[PDB]
Amino acid sequence: QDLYLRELKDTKLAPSTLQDAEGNVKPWNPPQKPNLPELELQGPEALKAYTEQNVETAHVAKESEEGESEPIEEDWLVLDDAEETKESH
Amino acid sequence: VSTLIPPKVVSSKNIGSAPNAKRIANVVHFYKSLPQGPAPAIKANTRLARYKAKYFDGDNASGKPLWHFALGIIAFGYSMEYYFH
């Protein structure tokens, strides 16, 4: 079918240099080889936080603090404070 | 930030303030307490204890001893009333 074959190879050759062959891109002047593979490759990184989220910075968990080894002052102070409130129950 | 511990601090002060003073006041008298009229000592004899038990006791507590004393003083004074006049 002449209505078929010629439109078929026209729709094949126009993106042939675009996609199949490495002839940059003929239909539109701006280059595509250094744009989507190269300039837009950082596109997700450009929209997002580059070198901050794509690297997935892992912060080591800070050591959970405690009474800081206070076996005398803390216990005595707690006992005294409870004694203060025990007279007013 | 932590759990203080009240529920076992009653050791230093017994619970309550006002009844604490009355606790020592009312716990000590129960030791040397008469069960039921211990050592009544209702019996005595010293030439006047019988009169005290019979008349000067709280059971009767009447005016009869006063009248008896008046009669006795009248009897005693009759003799010296005769002696004087």
Curated annotation (Swiss-Prot), chain A:
Residues 54-89 are annotated as: Disordered. It comes from Saccharomyces cerevisiae (strain ATCC 204508 / S288c). F-type ATPases have 2 components, CF(1) - the catalytic core - and CF(0) - the membrane proton channel. In yeast, the dimeric form of ATP synthase consists of 17 polypeptides: alpha, beta, gamma, delta, epsilon, 4 (B), 5 (OSCP), 6 (A), 8, 9 (C), d, E (Tim11), f, g, h, i/j and k. The keyword Transit peptide applies. It comes from the Eukaryota. It is found in: Mitochondrion; Mitochondrion inner membrane. Its main location: mitochondrion. The keyword Mitochondrion applies. This is ATP synthase subunit H, mitochondrial. Keywords: ATP synthesis, CF(0), Hydrogen ion transport, Ion transport, Membrane, Mitochondrion, Mitochondrion inner membrane, Transit peptide, Transport. Residues 65-89 have a biased composition (Acidic residues). Mitochondrial membrane ATP synthase (F(1)F(0) ATP synthase or Complex V) produces ATP from ADP in the presence of a proton gradient across the membrane which is generated by electron transport complexes of the respiratory chain. F-type ATPases consist of two structural domains, F(1) - containing the extramembraneous catalytic core and F(0) - containing the membrane proton channel, linked together by a central stalk and a peripheral stalk. During catalysis, ATP synthesis in the catalytic domain of F(1) is coupled via a rotary mechanism of the central stalk subunits to proton translocation. One of its GO terms (biological process) is proton transmembrane transport. The chain holds residues 36 to 124 of 124 of the full protein. Present with 6140 molecules/cell in log phase SD medium. Belongs to the ATPase h subunit family. GO terms for cellular component: mitochondrial inner membrane; mitochondrion; proton-transporting ATP synthase complex.
UniProtKB/Swiss-Prot annotation, chain B:
Keywords: ATP synthesis, CF(0), Hydrogen ion transport, Ion transport, Membrane, Mitochondrion, Mitochondrion inner membrane, Transit peptide, Transport. The keyword Transport applies. GO terms for cellular component: mitochondrial inner membrane; mitochondrion; proton-transporting ATP synthase complex. One of its GO terms (biological process) is proton transmembrane transport. It is found in: Mitochondrion; Mitochondrion inner membrane. Its main location: mitochondrion. It comes from the Eukaryota. F-type ATPases have 2 components, CF(1) - the catalytic core - and CF(0) - the membrane proton channel. In yeast, the dimeric form of ATP synthase consists of 17 polypeptides: alpha, beta, gamma, delta, epsilon, 4 (B), 5 (OSCP), 6 (A), 8, 9 (C), d, E (Tim11), f, g, h, i/j and k. Belongs to the ATPase F chain family. Mitochondrial membrane ATP synthase (F(1)F(0) ATP synthase or Complex V) produces ATP from ADP in the presence of a proton gradient across the membrane which is generated by electron transport complexes of the respiratory chain. F-type ATPases consist of two structural domains, F(1) - containing the extramembraneous catalytic core and F(0) - containing the membrane proton channel, linked together by a central stalk and a peripheral stalk. During catalysis, ATP synthesis in the catalytic domain of F(1) is coupled via a rotary mechanism of the central stalk subunits to proton translocation. Present with 14600 molecules/cell in log phase SD medium. This is ATP synthase subunit f, mitochondrial. It comes from Saccharomyces cerevisiae (strain ATCC 204508 / S288c). The lineage of its organism: Eukaryota, Fungi, Dikarya, Ascomycota, Saccharomycotina.
